[PDB]
Amino acid sequence: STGSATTTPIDSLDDAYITPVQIGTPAQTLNLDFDTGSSDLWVFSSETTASEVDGQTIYTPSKSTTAKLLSGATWSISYGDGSSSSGDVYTDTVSVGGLTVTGQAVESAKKVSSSFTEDSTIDGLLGLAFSTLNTVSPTQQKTFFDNAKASLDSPVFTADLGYHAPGTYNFGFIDTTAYTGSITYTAVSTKQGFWEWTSTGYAVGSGTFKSTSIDGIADTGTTLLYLPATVVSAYWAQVSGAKSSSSVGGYVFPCSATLPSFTFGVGSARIVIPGDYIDFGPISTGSSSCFGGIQSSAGIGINIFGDVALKAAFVVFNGATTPTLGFASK
């Protein structure tokens, strides 16, 4: 089997991407944030505290003939941004663009933190990291991909995120028309539950490529590119007036600047992030100071190849017995 669904930026800055997902019978379509950095499929629901729902579409398990409460199961998750959610669990039928999993754990939110309530465009998350990170207790549950893997033509999914434009998640096949050149595959460590890999270096604009190992995770659920402070300083040094602001929480730059590209290494191959992809706009409405899309990972404990980096590539999440990651230019 295969599936294919279009993923769309939620706003003009590509702050996140939403993909329609059909849950239950008859189908209830929710727009979920596909997140290769987490492993819970959770949704706003008829059980979510009413004051914490503000425009999201909700899953109502009582209206689904295939929903069954997973008795005694609860979930609770916290994300890198200070955000949190928790609730109970149903199993139900879940489909993504033609690909159907029966008995998928659908985690129904009873509580969500402020940042989720305040984002009316995201109805929940669909985790695509390894199932070892799933938070359901006392019986950990499998991700949508884990449940679908055996039925797929090939045990893979691909992320083709667009810059200020729609893109595609495919399950079970590699669309060889979607990228240029070849796909370079690179080893993955699953020990932390992430798609964790090692970039071979970087370049700033047309500058010299620096060969240096950068361990990090491929995370479609993180907006920006978080890299070591030395690398980030080298990048912003090329932007007149750019500076790290402790008040704002990262590197800012004059909105009038034209940003250089940033290249990262995948084995001997190179992925080029155009400068425009690194502009996240005014720090507050009407400001002439703009927020940078490359930021230091110092206060994270891990480097994160988030959407800023991944959208510059066609990315293969290969879930074979020994998982690997593939990157192609596009």
From Swiss-Prot:
UniProt keyword annotations, A-Z: Aspartyl protease, Disulfide bond, Hydrolase, Protease, Signal, Zymogen
Catalytic activity: Hydrolysis of proteins with specificity similar to that of pepsin A, prefers hydrophobic residues at P1 and P1', but does not cleave 14-Ala-|-Leu-15 in the B chain of insulin or Z-Glu-Tyr. Clots milk
EC number(s) stated in the UniProt entry for this protein: 3.4.23.22
Active site: D35, S199
Annotated S-S bridges: C255-C290
Keyword Transport: no
One GO BP annotation of this record: proteolysis
One Gene Ontology MF term: aspartic-type endopeptidase activity
Residue ranges of domain Peptidase A1 in the record: 17-328
Entry similarity comment: Belongs to the peptidase A1 family.
Annotated protein name in UniProt: Endothiapepsin
Gene symbol of the encoding locus: EAPA
Residues of the full protein shown: 90 to 419 of 419
